[PDB]
Design a protein around this nucleic acid. Sequence first.
DNA 1: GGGTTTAATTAGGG
DNA 2: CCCTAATTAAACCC
Length: 58
Amino acid sequence: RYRTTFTSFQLEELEKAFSRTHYPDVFTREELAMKIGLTEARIQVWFQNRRAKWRKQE
DNA sequence: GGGTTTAATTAGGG
DNA sequence: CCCTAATTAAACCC
């Protein structure tokens, strides 16, 4: 099973995107993908896990 | 190595 | 496709 090891860069940008919105549109997601060198799919997945984590800390 | 985090997958909702 | 909760398993880090 391949697992992505995100760089600190990818991670800080994912988090900055998340403060902006928990549910980014397609365009936001594809723009971020071009920026940080991840697929939209992996961003979507990161966002799924980020939202469940965020949810649990309430 | 093992406990914690967390990327990825599964099985469920419309 | 838009998601979820729960699970699985790999990476991080002491």
